[PDB]
Scaffold this active site. Sequence first.
Site, short mmCIF file in Angstrom:
data_model
loop_
_atom_site.label_atom_id
_atom_site.label_comp_id
_atom_site.label_asym_id
_atom_site.label_seq_id
_atom_site.Cartn_x
_atom_site.Cartn_y
_atom_site.Cartn_z
N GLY A 24 0.83 -1.20 0.00
CA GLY A 24 0.00 0.00 0.00
C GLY A 24 0.86 1.25 0.00
N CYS A 25 0.31 2.37 0.46
CA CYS A 25 1.07 3.62 0.53
C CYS A 25 2.43 3.28 1.12
CB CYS A 25 0.34 4.59 1.44
SG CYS A 25 1.19 6.15 1.83
N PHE A 26 3.51 3.56 0.40
CA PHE A 26 4.81 3.18 0.93
C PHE A 26 5.34 3.92 2.15
CE2 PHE A 26 6.64 5.27 -3.22
CZ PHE A 26 6.25 6.54 -2.79
#
Length: 183
Positions: A24-26
């Site tokens: 997901g969002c890193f």
Amino acid sequence: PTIPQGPDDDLPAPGQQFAQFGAGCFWGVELAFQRVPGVTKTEVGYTQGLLHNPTYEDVCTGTTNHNEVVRVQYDPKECSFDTLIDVLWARHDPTTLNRQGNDVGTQYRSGIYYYTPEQEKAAKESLERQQKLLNRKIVTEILPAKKFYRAEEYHQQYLAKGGRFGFMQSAEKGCNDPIRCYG
């Protein structure tokens, strides 16, 4: 073309090994790994897509097929690949396809990109163990690691730097303070 489809020819530091994870969002994913004892380096970037030298704006369009990932350098003598996989299962929901939380898109897909057959086997066996614990089917993709495009500096260690709201989240080893997505 083939450049982004090529392998990751980068060499980690001496005695270190590379690992790649998409969850997901890193931002939150990187913080999770920053806290792991044995991890010597973390960095976020784009990979598995078809566009050479992509920018955040490019990836945002969702047409490059690149995935937001964290490339980790770890010391195999101090941290096992399995421990890293366990961190992955604990950091995200591996049953949602092309989305994580409210971040929807192929650039937020779950994946483990291996550098060796040993990592591939470990990942597959770990997924089997984890699956028996979840009701939904795990959709995490386990594929060979490819060219890694390091993201812009403003994306690096973002949560530790303060996040969206200014409230810095600690990256100290062993920290178990709940990780907040954007700040």
